[PDB]
Write a protein that binds this ligand. Structure first.
Ligand code: 8O3
Ligand code: 8O3
Ligand code: 8O3
Ligand code: 8O3
Lengths: 726, 728
């Protein structure tokens, strides 16, 4: 017996997580049963913070809780209703922990788009109907900060579609000052933004299908406009209306279309803003500090920090995030150095010259902590493996004494790490995502001492001993003397003598990584375990975490090098003796579906069959912020001619050599069903047969319990059929 | 004949069938296109001149889609820039050409985007519809007259039918009715103001960045229907200052009490017109006969001249009340109505005498009246050999109803037992269109003596190229179920033998008053499946089929999805026990209603069919338009038939699709049976975890008639069949 498709679809062998919430510098909450505990990191003992019966007679079902920073109130989230990738709307009830009652007077309105606490205390701000309301106390009436909230037009406190999906990766457009004082927010105006219209069929009893309409700026279309505002909460008036001071953009940004990409608070009176231009290769860092005189926010032109690029676009997916020191006069920002590798640089608010404190043929992933004596960061520097992750601590007084805190803990089963720090970076938890079963340990920062193991997945590990689990080989091949990485989910009892069918699991998106040391139980696990299928992934040009030399290779050339490298990789995978070159499939989702489609039409005879789920077909169809970031603008004076060259429809004739399976969701707000609609029509006009499958009222995720089981049961047969498997 | 009829020969259309589509310009001559040239043939002796050459508009600069000669012959209407809309509707650009001058008319040209145009029955009076407003053009080069002034897109339809009256009622985009002399122009006005709108996406060429949303006034079962008013105008008394006064003919009080339709408009004489009205509950029609008052200029409809036609066992008519055929004086008319025995035969009526007297009778039905003279009435009926799938032309003397003489039964009973006819102006001659069972044959006859003059087209060229082909044979027979004779047909593969077991495909439609079993000769996908893949394509006509009486047609009345589904399973069970039919390989495929039956049959869990293909199927009858659905289902209300509306959905059988292999196909731009229906089908199958094959067609409507899409769907369905039947 092996890892079956039923196991994957039903979550038979479930990984164990350790979700903890640092409430202080030495205490973190943990989800035990349904009770809430409060662990003392120093001693490992806990004490019950809330029984699982406090909400026994509640009447609804909490989806997520939110204790106030001080610990005097707890916000309850129920009636969850999902919207886009990150956005959602739900209901909220405030619980007075001290009174041990439930707030009934002046309750948060239902259908609230976003809510969040202030960093300290119990001050509360939430967005409802596209407008910002702040409640100094849970029982006090809320103050209306904005009055221009308007559905599908004016977004105050929340991001619109493109900003949520392509920039902030969150529905929240609010930013609290370090302490409960100021509230910064953005205002998005989608008045002149075109609308995407697709049909929604709803439940069986919906006689006339509803037509969904979303402000969706496509490639080169009219983009939404952004305004930034800051308002003081400790001065709100119940008589007159609160005044919000608007922070404008530098002239280098106002000269044309632009975006807002980052908002980070330096000190209690200093706030950092980063602006991006339509043609996203020139960033600007405006540092604003409060003025007690005029009550305005002045941004010293003497404090800017220009960040441009020449080989490609600025930032991986956006300009990096600044990490200001405790005093707000020096920060750390991950940027790509001279040779093209992203490393931690050290800035001065007054000096426009940053000083890199790290360097090498690798990249710093993120900056996780900044104390007085040590800066903490994640990077793929260990053993020159980009697909690996470890935590290094660097001394601020010596840019040479760098210590790794995770490379050597358990190098056998731990090469991909994550960390969560306490409030004052006195302790930290380490997540070991792979290559072995996940591991959760607690550490004390004083001497980087290891305290205990919080979770080791020993319960799960006991089960896999009887099932035939697949092995995962991570290695590299050579393209034009450059070293590119790949991974192979090898079936159980792998024999290099027998010929195996190879399935190429591909994404190939800008700054992507499908080859890593991460342990995961997915559809590829069943394919190799039960069907004895070598499912592999490859990181060609465009893949990130390896320098701008590789990533920026596809700048303005989307659907070219990243497509060729995949073909080239499978070309060399087909000569390994254990790979039946006559049965090499490929499949991809989202961007991967676009590459898969661009591959099956390449006319190379390398691949026999393929599957493309929710693929892009024409870059003019996708949203602007993402598309234009890499392609430019669809104009004959910019890069229109490559927009027209990279369409998968213009490559239909060559689909006669391969079996194709096109799958898409009829409610895909992200990669509109229009994309696959144009693909099928192009194949029809050249007499190319293919398989297809639409999923009614499904989005880009196709995450419905029934839909998810259906699409993977459907693709599995297509693969078994193609490889001639029982 | 070592070669067989393949799918390429069908898709690429190798063996093409010829016709002889003429146009009677009078009682003596007709027009027929020869070799890009329009000719004029003399029915008496077969001589011919040339009415227009290929090198006449050769330099016109427009790919002419169609022409339109005038009754007299002084002008010819040219139709170019054709733009299809729905089934019968479209908008094209028009140009007039003066035959007596050989010059294109340019003064006050007919506007572009014109929705409908047509001359007067005699002369050269012209009336067209532009922006939903009627225009009258007395002379082809003089200014037009603004008849109606309420034209409004998707709201007010003047002179044209909306979507519902175009598909289910008149089967035409035209809402104009000239009087014989052309003096009066009768028209109807539709109002879809309160009608809901169906909204689906249109994707267009690659270059369209944002998908367009198509919105169409479409009344689903239960929703409010469009409202209709009727008007008449005197095309002579055209003021052009005060324009025109549109006299309105009000509907009968029996109809105005509630929702109702306008189902038929037939002119009796130069001053008498008959209007048939239909109620929401399609079982009570009322014909109104109105005369033009020469003193007040009004239109009164005497109650004595008003005729009631109702039905108790179902809906009245096959799809709508029959059209009346009035006499010369316009005081009596012969109309097709259902007998007291349940069969549809011709009845003789009088203007002011309600009790009609049938001139025909028997266990057969009259398909339709083709021509009416002062002494004989020519009609088509499935009487000969008692075959419901046959069509022959009959001639009955109006002074003696025993003088029943068939004109086509005996011409060639071998290759012809299904006839279509086209008479002259006064029926001096008539063309016979034998569609089957042999190769189509076109002939011309003279009614004065009823003798064959000359053969128009015997498709001898087609017969010459089928020599080197292994054609399938077609058998027409019947089985018996509960003392009733139900008919079926099979397309047997060439060299048929009972010593083998054949895969059998059940081609189905099974709609109300339908008939998939007949004698017609066809070259289609079924011919390829039988000729090449050796598949027995069979069809069955039982319970709900027309032309067999009301007791069979009105059986599924207010009960769709039970009798049609049950008989197809019963017939398939019958055919599976004949001997030469294999049990392991039996399928079923249907288009439109046939797709609804195909899905219902597979969802029945009867366990008979290995696979099944449904193309543009109906899901629930709440999704389809009102007039068609409510004609067979009543209203979807608790006090009517809502309970059956819900127990007849195909989604409620998603659980039973685990046994059968399913293939769902539907066009994205389908405005008749919306893609919404198939979307709900797949969603139901997904919610119960049953795998199936699916295929959408971008921008394709309910026809899937595109050149590239037609070949693609049948190529995909051929693979689905060949793999389900394990055929090499
Ligand atoms: N960009 C996403 C990649 C993705 O969607 N995949 C990759 C693998 N195959 C798929 O089909 C789906 C991941 C991602 C999205 C965010 F919004 C974000 F904030 C952070 C993230 F890491
Ligand atoms: N829009 C993209 C957002 C993204 O990639 N990231 C990277 C991780 N960090 C982020 O902030 C967000 C994802 C995406 C790309 C496609 F090409 C596509 F077809 C569909 C998609 F969903
Ligand atoms: N109702 C239509 C049913 C049909 O023939 N089918 C359905 C499936 N696809 C086909 O090609 C065959 C035919 C039809 C006949 C008339 F006489 C008429 F006036 C209007 C019509 F629409
Ligand atoms: N709407 C129907 C019109 C019709 O059948 N006729 C019969 C021949 N004479 C006429 O006047 C029109 C056709 C139809 C029925 C369905 F159930 C369906 F799903 C789709 C369809 F197109």
């Amino acid at each position: 017996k092996t890892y079956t498709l039923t196991d994957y679809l039903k979550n038979t062998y479930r990984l164990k997580l350790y979700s903890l919430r640092w409430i202080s510098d030495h205490e973190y909450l943990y989800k035990q049963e349904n009770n809430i505990l409060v662990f003392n990191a120093e001693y490992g003992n806990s004490s019950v913070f809330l029984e699982n019966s406090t909400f026994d007679e509640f009447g609804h079902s909490i989806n997520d809780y939110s204790i106030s920073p001080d610990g005097q109130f707890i916000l309850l989230e129920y009636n969850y209703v999902k919207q886009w990738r990150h956005s959602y709307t739900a209901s909220y009830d405030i619980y007075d922990l001290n009174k041990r009652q439930l707030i009934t007077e002046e309750r948060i309105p239902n259908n609230t788009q976003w809510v969040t606490w202030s960093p300290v205390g119990h001050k509360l701000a939430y967005v409802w109907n596209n407008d910002i309301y702040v409640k100094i106390e849970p029982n006090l009436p809320s103050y209306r900060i904005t009055w221009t909230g308007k559905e599908d037009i004016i977004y105050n406190g929340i991001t619109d579609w493109v900003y949520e999906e392509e920039v902030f990766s969150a529905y929240s457009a609010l930013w609290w000052s370090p302490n409960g004082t100021f509230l910064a927010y953005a205002q998005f105006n989608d008045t002149e933004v075109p609308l995407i219209e697709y049909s929604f069929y709803s439940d069986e009893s919906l006689q006339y299908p509803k037509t969904v309409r979303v402000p969706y700026p496509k490639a080169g279309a009219v983009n939404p406009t952004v305004k930034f505002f800051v308002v003081n909460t400790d001065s709100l008036s119940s008589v007159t209306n609160a005044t919000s001071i608007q922070i404008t953009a530098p002239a280098s940004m106002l000269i044309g279309d632009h975006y807002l990409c980052d908002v980070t608070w330096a000190t209690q009176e200093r706030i950092s803003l980063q602006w991006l231009r339509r043609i996203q290769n020139y960033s600007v860092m405006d540092i604003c500090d409060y003025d007690e005189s005029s009550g305005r926010w002045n941004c010293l032109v003497a404090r800017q920090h220009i960040e441009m690029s020449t080989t490609g676009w600025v930032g991986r997916f956006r300009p990096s995030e600044p990490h200001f020191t405790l005093d707000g006069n020096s920060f750390y920002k991950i940027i790509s150095n001279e040779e093209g590798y992203r490393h931690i640089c050290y800035f001065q608010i007054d000096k426009k010259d940053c000083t890199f404190i790290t360097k090498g043929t690798w990249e710093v992933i993120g900056i996780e902590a900044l104390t007085s004596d040590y800066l903490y960061y994640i990077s793929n520097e260990y053993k020159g493996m980009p697909g690996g992750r470890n935590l290094y601590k660097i001394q601020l007084s010596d840019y040479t004494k760098v210590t790794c805190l995770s490379c050597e803990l358990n190098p056998e089963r731990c090469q991909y790490y994550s960390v969560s720090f306490s409030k004052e970076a006195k302790y930290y938890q380490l997540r070991c995502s792979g290559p072995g079963l996940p591991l959760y340990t607690l550490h004390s920062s004083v001497n980087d001492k290891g305290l205990r193991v919080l979770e080791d997945n020993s319960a799960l590990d006991k089960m896999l001993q009887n099932v035939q689990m697949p092995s995962k080989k991570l290695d590299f091949i050579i393209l034009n003397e450059t070293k590119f990485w790949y991974q192979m989910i090898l079936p159980p009892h792998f024999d290099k003598s027998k010929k195996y069918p190879l399935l190429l699991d591909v994404y190939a998106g800008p700054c992507s990584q499908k080859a890593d040391t991460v342990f995961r139980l997915n559809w590829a696990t069943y394919l190799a375990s039960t069907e004895n299928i070598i499912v592999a992934s490859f990181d060609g040009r465009g893949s990130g975490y390896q320098g701008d030399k590789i990533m920026h290779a596809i700048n303005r050339r989307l659907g070219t090098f990243e497509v060729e490298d995949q073909i080239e990789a499978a070309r060399q995978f087909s000569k390994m003796g254990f790979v039946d070159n006559k049965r090499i499939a490929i499949w991809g989702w989202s961007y991967g579906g676009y590459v898969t489609s661009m591959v099956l039409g390449s006319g190379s005879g390398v691949f026999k069959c393929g599957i493309a789920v929710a693929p892009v077909s024409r870059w003019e169809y996708y949203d602007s912020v993402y598309t234009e970031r890499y392609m430019g603008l669809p104009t004959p004076e910019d890069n229109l001619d490559h927009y027209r060259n990279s369409t998968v429809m213009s490559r239909a004739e060559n689909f006669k050599q391969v079996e194709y399976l096109l799958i898409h969701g009829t409610a895909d707000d992200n990669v509109h069903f229009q994309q696959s609609a144009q693909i099928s029509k192009a194949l029809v006009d050249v007499g190319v047969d293919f398989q297809a499958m639409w999923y009614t009222d499904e989005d880009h995720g196709i995450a419905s319990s029934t839909a998810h089981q259906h699409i993977y049961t459907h693709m599995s047969h297509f693969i078994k059929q193609c490889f001639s498997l029982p």
